[PDB]
Amino acid sequence: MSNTLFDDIFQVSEVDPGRYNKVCRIEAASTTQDQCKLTLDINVELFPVAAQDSLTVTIASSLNATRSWRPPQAGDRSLADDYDYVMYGTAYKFEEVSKDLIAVYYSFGGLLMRLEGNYRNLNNLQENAYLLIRR
Amino acid sequence: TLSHLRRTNTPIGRDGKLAKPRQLHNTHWGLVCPAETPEGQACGLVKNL
Amino acid sequence: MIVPVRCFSCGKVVGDKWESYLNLLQEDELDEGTALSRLGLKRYCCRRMILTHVDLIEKFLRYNPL
Amino acid sequence: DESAPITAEDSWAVISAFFREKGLVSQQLD
Amino acid sequence: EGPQVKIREASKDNVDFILSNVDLAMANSLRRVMIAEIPTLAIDSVEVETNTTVLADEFIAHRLGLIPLQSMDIEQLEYSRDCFCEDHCDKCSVVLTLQAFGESESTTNVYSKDLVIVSNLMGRNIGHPIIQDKEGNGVLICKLRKGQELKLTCVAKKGIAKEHAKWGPAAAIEFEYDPWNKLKHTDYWYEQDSAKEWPQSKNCEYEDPPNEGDPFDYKAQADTFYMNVESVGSIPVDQVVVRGIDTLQKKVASILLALTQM
Amino acid sequence: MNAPDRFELFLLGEGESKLKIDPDTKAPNAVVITFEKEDHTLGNLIRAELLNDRKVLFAAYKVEHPFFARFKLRIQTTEGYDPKDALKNACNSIINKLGALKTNFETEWNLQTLA
Amino acid sequence: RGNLMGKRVDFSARTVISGDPNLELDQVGVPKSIAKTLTYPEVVTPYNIDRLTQLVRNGPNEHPGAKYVIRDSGDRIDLRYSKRAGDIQLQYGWKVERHIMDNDPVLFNRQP
Amino acid sequence: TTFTHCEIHPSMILGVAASIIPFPDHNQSPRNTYQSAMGKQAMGVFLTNYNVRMDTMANILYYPQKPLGTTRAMEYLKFRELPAGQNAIVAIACYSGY
Amino acid sequence: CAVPLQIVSPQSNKPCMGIVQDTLCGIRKLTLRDTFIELDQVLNMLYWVPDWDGVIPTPAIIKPKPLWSGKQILSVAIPNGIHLQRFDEGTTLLSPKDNGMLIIDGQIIFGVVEKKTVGSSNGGLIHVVTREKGPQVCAKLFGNIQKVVNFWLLHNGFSTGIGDTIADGPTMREITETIAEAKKKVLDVTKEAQANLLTAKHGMTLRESFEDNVVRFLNEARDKAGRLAEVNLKDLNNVKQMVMAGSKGSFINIAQMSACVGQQSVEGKRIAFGFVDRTLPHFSKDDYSPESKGFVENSYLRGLTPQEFFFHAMGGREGLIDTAVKTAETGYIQR
Amino acid sequence: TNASPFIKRDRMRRNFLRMR
Amino acid sequence: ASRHGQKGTIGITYRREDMPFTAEGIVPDLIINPHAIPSRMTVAHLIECLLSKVAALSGNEGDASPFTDITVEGISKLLREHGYQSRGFEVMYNGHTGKKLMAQIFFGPTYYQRLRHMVDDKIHARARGPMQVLTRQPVEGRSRDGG
Ligand SMILES: [Zn+2]
Ligand SMILES: [Zn+2]
């Protein structure tokens, strides 16, 4: 029941410092969907990044309203939790540009991102989501 | 005490002007302290050598 | 006045080396810094106590009451 | 030399002699 | 066995050592009990028979209050609050007498060895004044000349350090962990360089430099402590460490038995 | 003066225990305990070691105001398992660990002993 | 001016403040000597009877404390001497004076 | 280059309490004004004969220390001999309550 | 006459209450993007809020460790259903300069808490919650955010020092040459006056135009110096953190203390010819140089000359006497 | 430079005892 | 008050078991708010504290000397070679738990003094006391228990 709703390989152009010491900024393009564009905020130190790095993103609707959070309970969790960068937040706003390219801006607590793409224009997400990034 | 021995005091009146000697003047150099003034209704009246 | 007891900063026993700290000026002609070195308070927290105490009890007691 | 000029440090002795002569309450006393 | 301990240096009066395979709360509680709950004996109540000096009487009292005493057998006696009696029985307190005279032409001194044991000492090594110098002298009290008399009746009861610093044995502490910022719990202030604008720890050599380029160790945890405790000398330093351990354990055992009563 | 008295540092109050338990209604199996006449000495240690065991769920403690030598503590755990037995197990773990510390320190200071 | 549009008063306090970050806005911190000194009249109902009786038994000293009692007529019995201390039954329709227990409403001033 | 006179020292334009202000250039002038107003209300010691010299008001502390900082002038004001307050170890921290 | 219906002053058509200096500085510390927090803190603050629902918020970021933002934990203390927009000069929904403020459903999304949003203002947060929700829940709002910022600021710790004040040496010599070229242009204008060929600007007199010129040149020198000092000053400078955090001090305060003072004066004119032909008896005759009248060259930190000390005392004493007369006059007219 | 942060007096009294 | 006009009063007193403390355990005597500093513009207090610390470590007494050449650079280099921080900041610990503190603290010896307006002459309260015969109002004066 808990599924990915968008998943592709994305290639970063470069990284901005943003005069901080634990966070930075990423912007990336798809290999496949040339219409689609990615930008993303990131804890820079705890997963280091570089230019020309291929990365993979994931919607992760849930992991199969949630209750109070459980301490991670080290037994096997057959969920969408076996990548590296796992990240949870909230959507707030939908945007329509060029009459074709939909745009939504989620959040992550104190982190922001910009996302494009016009094929999945109902399959895209809705109020909150997770995120999964590999390697 | 060694402050209070060297005190000076003028009479002026009730309200007075301001360019008149309520405020300090350049002539005061080397003679009277430009900081040790009392505060409250008589600042620039009492002054200390 | 009296050199006090048990430093506010550290708290060890202070004033054992007091008249010691006296007699290392007169009959030794000894500079105070090496004099405090040999006196042996390796912190400064007690070094200041004897550095800024001023005797008053001599000027007190050289009255003759009663 | 004794006939040398006077460094800015030196004038405290002049202040010493002046106060040992006059005293602080000299105005009232005089 | 768990909390391994290693000595660095020892003397009569200060002990510096190593505490490892322990926890931060354990060390902090050890410090707190080490400054707070070590019962001893000191002078508390004073009876001025007759004063003549140029000092006043409660001044002499507060001056007296900081003189430490011998503190071996302090477990043997009992607190006056728990004692069944009233007004300082020999089981619960000791008695102090001081005498001075104005004999000489020159000024006279009073040292803290001049006070004497008065009542039943009942064989328990208690209440001698501490001498530290080469010359037999407990620290100064008051100065007299030719005409002044002091007769002091004094009573010393138990007391603890937590309500008043009179019964504090510690009067110094030292505390260090991660001298080389590997746990990275805080940065340093700098204006152009973190390194040269700060000095190295004295504890530098017992842990290696942080390898200069490895990623931030995240799952590390606090260990490898550096405790230097310098007591006043009213009671020996081993005795204050083992007794601070003893009063911490009796406190936790008391709250456990109160719980199982409940 | 008739403030509350100075025996509130360490002495027990008459007609009143060292502690009073109290059941919450906010969460399942959630209880708060009132302590008084002590401080962060016991507080920080009992919270940290009860946090270290993982069958229990959540804890924190705080002082209301420094003028009163009292503090509170809030415990819940999963079903069947009980907060009171959990913290009594925690206290046995405490007394065992420190007793090992005491005897190991004693053997270490004796094997130090100069000459 | 000094007697009609302003004058001296009763039930007054005058000290110096310190801050605190743990007390919200509608509270105020009041020292206990002042709470012993002040007073406030109440009435005797079936509702307040037991708490008021207990506070009367508490004497003029212990901090939830009483100082004066008023019966039906012009009655001012003072509790300080009061050798019949543990004996008054405190009938209805009466007035007692007590110290400031907590969350009482209280008006504040600062000059000017 | 046509002088006829020089002052003894520029520090000596001040007054009595103005001597006690440490580094009195290195602040703002109304702070010097409140300091000169404040210093008259300080306790400490006033004379030495006070065991005999009766008066209505008298305020004597216990342990008076000469200040660690000083200027040259209050040596001549005898303030080193008879000080006002004592030194302490102060902190600058917003320590969360008070 | 209780507080919670006196939150907005009727007299000033805006709320006049407010969270104030220390908690204001601490909440500016907390709201920053770059910081985070750990379990042992966030658990303790969550127990510290008195009306907490018994529910922890979710982890913001999960991967080795639960962590949270200060915005995430403050969103617990903000009660629900409250909405604000700031949108000033950056704020393109993906804020690079991180100004602005926007809250949906009582939860922080982004932005930097600052007195010009969270203190007393016309579109104040306090104004919003009092006007909408009901004017006594705001009392507990002050209690919540005050207690939370206090307890987090305890284990954080914050202070300042002289290392805030002193700055870079090349910038110091840039301040020096800026003042020097200002003095050079002043000297050029005085030479033009002394050769009697001038504009003699319309309206006022020749001397008045000369005074207007030299005052404008020296004020431009002062605030250009202050702009250079402030833009050099670092981002970990704690008093810069204080002032753009709000509560106390200003750009003028920092520049005044750190670079220069500017010419002290009484009633607009600079320090008058008290003695004959000159200002003070310590210079040669008949001068209008910035030293002569006494434009203040130095900052606080390097010290003063006694002449500048004297002029500083002059301007201060003028401020004190005007205050001590105006208080009696304003009391009479108010009554 | 020496810049004179602190100064001595009786050492100079002695230097003038040898000078005179 | 200070030697620069920092009057006020005393909030509370704790004890050393939760006072902030350093590596050498030099517990403070008193702690105030930094927000006095960038509003009252009192640099002279800070330079007094720094010179006081270098005087305490040196053994020499200090100097103020209103119009002279003693600078922060000479003070900094002297205290630096005495083996501390070049400006007066300091590593410091939590009072309660003893975790590391984020910022650092300018902290050291300074000269204070005691005023006259103590609290016991100013605490005053009254209810239903003496009457003035001219006006039937509460009488004046803290001495005769006024209002
Ligand atoms: Zn010490
Ligand atoms: Zn007994």
DSSP string for G32-60: HHHHHH--EE----SSSHHHHHHHHHTTT
Distances, alpha carbon H26 to alpha carbons A14, B37, I233, K95, in Å: 50, 19, 21, 33
Answer yes or no: do K60 and J4 touch at CB < 8 A.
no
Radius of gyration of the CA atoms of chain C, in A: 13
H96 contacts in chain I (CB < 8 Å): 150-151, 153-154
F95, E252 in Cβ contact below 8 A?
Answer: yes
Q: Which one of the ligands is nearest to E171 CA?
A: 1
For I257, the token pair is: 């203390």
| Rounded Cα–Cα distance for residues F92 and G77 (Å) | 59
Residue among E87, E167, E156, E89 nearest E127 (CA)? E156
Nearest-Cα distance to chain C for H90, in Å, is 11
CA dihedral of residues A49, A54, A60, A63 (deg, nearest 10):
-70
Site of tokens 């008076």:
H64
| Rounded Cα–Cα distance for residues E251 and H55 (Å) | 54
H/E stretch holding I111 reads: strand I107-111
For I300, the token pair is: 């606080």
Which among K24, K27, K109 has CB closest to C48?
K109
B5 contacts in chain D (CB < 8 Å): 24-25, 28
**Quick check: A45 contacting E, CB < 8 Å?**
yes
| Rounded Cα–Cα distance for residues E241 and E59 (Å) | 33
Report the separation in Å between the CA atom of E61 and the middle of ligand 2, taken as the mean of its atom positions.
22
DSSP symbols for E52-85: -SSS-HHHHHHHHTT-BEEEGGGGTS--TTT-SS
G65, G58 in Cβ contact below 8 A?
Answer: yes
Bond into E209 cis (ω within 30): no
F114 in helix, strand or coil?
A: coil
The domain I160-305 is placed in CATH, from the list 3.40.50.300, 3.20.20.30, 1.10.132.30, 2.60.120.10, at: 1.10.132.30
Neighbours, chain A (3 or more CB pairs < 8 A): E, I
Q: Which fold has domain E40-165?
A: RNA Polymerase Alpha Subunit; Chain A, domain 2 (2.170.120)
I46, I58 in Cβ contact below 8 A?
Answer: no
I94-102 long-range CB contacts below 8 Å, 24 or more apart?
A: I94/A39, I94/A105, I94/A112, I94/A114, I95/A112, I96/A18, I98/I33
Question: Who surrounds ion ligand 1 at CB < 5 A?
Answer: C 7, 9-10, 45-46
| Rounded Cα–Cα distance for residues A111 and E160 (Å) | 54
Answer yes or no: do G26 and I143 touch at CB < 8 A.
no
H/E stretch holding E151 reads: strand E150-157
The verdict on domain E1-39+166-262 having CATH code 3.30.1360.10 is yes
| Rounded Cα–Cα distance for residues E175 and E201 (Å) | 12
Residues found in chain E? 262
CA geometry: angle I290, I294, I297, nearest 5 deg? 70
Q: Which experimental approach was used here?
A: cryo-EM
Residue spans of the domains in chain C: they are 1-66
CB atoms near residue I92 (< 10 Å): 9
E38, E242 in Cβ contact below 8 A?
Answer: no
Structural domain that includes position F96: 1-115
Task: Write the CB contacts of A68 (distance below 8 Å, at least 6 apart in sequence).
Answer: I54, I55, I56
K30-32 and H87-92 strand pairing: parallel
The packing angle between helices I39-48 and I70-77, to 10°, is 20
Residue spans of the domains in chain E: they are 1-39+166-262, 40-165
For I67, the token pair is: 């962590």
Q: What is the CATH number of the domain that holds F73?
A: 3.30.1360.10
F114 contacts in chain E (CB < 8 Å): 10
E69, E41 in Cβ contact below 8 A?
Answer: yes
Q: What is the SS3 assignment for A24-45? A: EEEEEEECCCCCCEEEEEEECC
DSSP state of E146: S
Q: Which fold has domain C1-66?
A: Arc Repressor Mutant, subunit A (1.10.10)
The verdict on domain I7-159 having CATH code 1.10.1760.20 is no
Task: Write the CB contacts of I196 (distance below 8 Å, at least 6 apart in sequence).
Answer: none
G62 contacts in chain F (CB < 8 Å): 2
A108 in helix, strand or coil?
A: strand
Domains of chain A: 1-135 (2.40.50.140)
Which among H48, H51, H66 has CB closest to C59?
H48
Strand order in the sheet with I107-111: I84-85, I101-104, I107-111
- CB contacts under 8 A, H 36-55 vs B, are 36-37, 39-40, 46
* Smallest CA–CA distance from K1 into chain H, residue: H38
**Quick check: I317 contacting B, CB < 8 Å?**
yes
| Rounded Cα–Cα distance for residues K85 and K57 (Å) | 13
Terminal alpha carbon distance of chain J: 29
Nearest-Cα distance to chain D for H8, in Å, is 6
CA dihedral of residues I30, I33, I38, I44 (deg, nearest 10):
30
Interior/surface letters E164-184, b for 16+ CB within 10 angstroms, e for the rest: ebbbbbbbbbebebbbeebee
Partners of H87 in the β-ladder: K111
Residue among I116, H32, I94, H94 nearest K41 (CA)? H32
Nearest-Cα distance to chain G for K34, in Å, is 16
Domain count within chain F = 1
I72, A110 in Cβ contact below 8 A?
Answer: yes
| Rounded Cα–Cα distance for residues F100 and E108 (Å) | 54
| Rounded Cα–Cα distance for residues E70 and A62 (Å) | 70
I103 in helix, strand or coil?
A: strand
Question: Within 13 A of C61's CA, how many CA atoms are on the CB side?
Answer: 21
Partners of F58 in the β-ladder: F76
Q: Where are the beta strands (DSSP E) in chain K?
A: 30-32, 107-111, 124-126
Task: Write the CB contacts of I116 (distance below 8 Å, at least 6 apart in sequence).
Answer: I246
| Rounded Cα–Cα distance for residues F47 and A23 (Å) | 32
K104, K79 in Cβ contact below 8 A?
Answer: no
Q: Which residues of C are annotated as a binding site for Zn(2+)?
A: 7, 10, 45-46
K55, I264 in Cβ contact below 8 A?
Answer: no
